[PDB]
Amino acid sequence: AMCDAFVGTWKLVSSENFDDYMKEVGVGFATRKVAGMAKPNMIISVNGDVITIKSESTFKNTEISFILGQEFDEVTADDRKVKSTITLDGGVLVHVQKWDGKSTTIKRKREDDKLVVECVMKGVTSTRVYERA
Ligand SMILES: O=C(O)c1c(N2CCCCC2)nc2ccc(Cl)cc2c1-c1ccccc1
């Protein structure tokens, strides 16, 4: 599959504006401070139509498994109970989370040897760059 580009184990190497993104999402002070320190690994695997994305860190471990285009329940690292849908749009994994009348969009894409994750809440964008572990 094309989703091959994404499979593997990735380590966070840089972050920009994540604190600001988390504020916009509504994450509280203490969670933001601890989550912001974390250097998670992101583990992406595919088994048939099922994609699994795991985040492993000192703060929280999370795991989502899904089929493209099929809405699912997700409890996020900051304990939001959200409705998520993930699609593959021109090679970019696009993940939309809906909760309490709010929405955020997280895009995962390959750029050179990096996996670039861009998170947007209203106007506030954060960029998280990962390299292969
Ligand atoms: O890395 C994450 O999976 C990730 C995340 N994802 C990934 C990119 C940011 C937006 C969606 N969104 C978050 C939203 C709010 C909070 Cl408190 C944490 C996260 C974390 C996260 C950060 C550090 C350790 C563990 C999990």
Swiss-Prot record:
Keywords: Acetylation, Cytoplasm, Lipid-binding, Nucleus, Phosphoprotein, Transport
PROSITE patterns noted in UniProt: FABP (PS00214)
Source organism superkingdom: Eukaryota
Subcellular location: Cytoplasm; Nucleus
GO annotation, cellular component aspect: cytoplasm; cytosol; extracellular exosome; lipid droplet; nucleus
Effect of mutating E24D: In a breast cancer sample; somatic mutation
GO BP annotation list: brown fat cell differentiation; cellular response to lithium ion; cellular response to tumor necrosis factor; cholesterol homeostasis; fatty acid transport; long-chain fatty acid transport; negative regulation of DNA-templated transcription; positive regulation of cold-induced thermogenesis
Residues annotated with Phosphotyrosine modification: Y21
Pfam families found in the cross-reference section: Lipocalin
Residues with PTM N-acetylcysteine: C3
Residues the record lists as binding a fatty acid: R128, V129, Y130
Sequence motif Nuclear localization signal, residues: 23-33
Gene Ontology MF terms: fatty acid binding; hormone receptor binding; long-chain fatty acid binding; long-chain fatty acid transmembrane transporter activity
Modified residues (Phosphoserine): S14
Role description: Lipid transport protein in adipocytes. Binds both long chain fatty acids and retinoic acid. Delivers long-chain fatty acids and retinoic acid to their cognate receptors in the nucleus.
PANTHER family attached to this UniProt entry: FATTY ACID BINDING PROTEIN (PTHR11955)
Sequence similarity: Belongs to the calycin superfamily. Fatty-acid binding protein (FABP) family.
Domain comment in the entry: Forms a beta-barrel structure that accommodates hydrophobic ligands in its interior.
Subunit and partners: Monomer. Homodimer. Interacts with PPARG.
Protein name: Fatty acid-binding protein, adipocyte
Organism, scientific name: Homo sapiens (Human)
Originating gene: FABP4
